[PDB]
């Protein structure tokens, strides 16, 4: 059966409004996966996001109009063939990328089936999915920040003391030869 023009408009409007508030939109090829798999992926997502994340297979035409109206650009390359969409409306989005990345891995699926998307308003490619998926926890990040911020000072001491080490290194070298 055909959908009324009004029914279609409502679906497009709803989707468009959702994409206007999401912090992540990732496009995935979910062909071949079973309902059991869908159920498991959704469960892994919910355990971490509750209702803040969704994973739904959505017809390309619908996705296109919704993205178009939400004012997105350069997404057409992500809608070639049946495509499912993973989006986050509440909570930090990084963990959802990790979840679906590790799910495809557990299922032994081609990781290129994770086509790319938009993260916090920034477009990312398929190859970049791995980058996001492997990001360390926020806590680990905060920890690393301190040493990164101290680098200049750390580098100064290392450079000055390195002048003395060069003498030691070359003397050892001369001893090495013999």
């Amino acid at each position: 059966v055909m959908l009324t023009r009004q029914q279609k408009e409502l679906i497009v409007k709803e989707m468009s409004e959702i994409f206007k508030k999401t912090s992540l939109i990732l496009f995935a090829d979910f062909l071949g996966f079973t309902v059991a798999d869908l159920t498991e992926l959704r469960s892994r997502l919910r355990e971490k996001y509750g209702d803040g994340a969704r994973f739904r297979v959505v017809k390309n035409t619908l996705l296109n109009l919704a993205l178009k109206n939400a004012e997105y650009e350069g997404y057409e390359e992500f809608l070639k063939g049946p495509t499912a969409v993973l989006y986050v409306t509440e909570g930090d989005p990084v963990e959802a990328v990790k979840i679906i990345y590790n799910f495809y891995k557990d299922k032994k699926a081609d990781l290129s089936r994770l086509k790319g998307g938009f993260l916090e308003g920034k477009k990312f490619t398929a190859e970049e999915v791995e980058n996001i998926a492997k990001l360390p926890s926020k806590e680990e990040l905060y920890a690393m920040l301190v040493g990164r911020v101290k680098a200049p000072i750390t580098g100064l001491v290392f450079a000055l003391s390195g002048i003395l080490r060069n003498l030691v290194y070359v003397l050892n070298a001369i001893k090495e030869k013999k």
């Binding site: 989005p93 990084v94 916090e120 990001l135 920040l145 680098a151 200049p152 750390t154 580098g155």
Partner: peptide, 30 residues
């Protein structure tokens, strides 16, 4: 901005933004 202002802006960053900060700092120093 002041030290305090810097720290405040830092703790408001998302995980993605914070990771970007760490990497750029990484490229700029050391």
């Amino acid at each position: 901005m002041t030290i305090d202002e810097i720290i405040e802006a830092i703790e408001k960053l998302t995980v993605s933004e914070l990771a970007e900060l760490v990497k750029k700092l990484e490229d700029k120093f050391g």
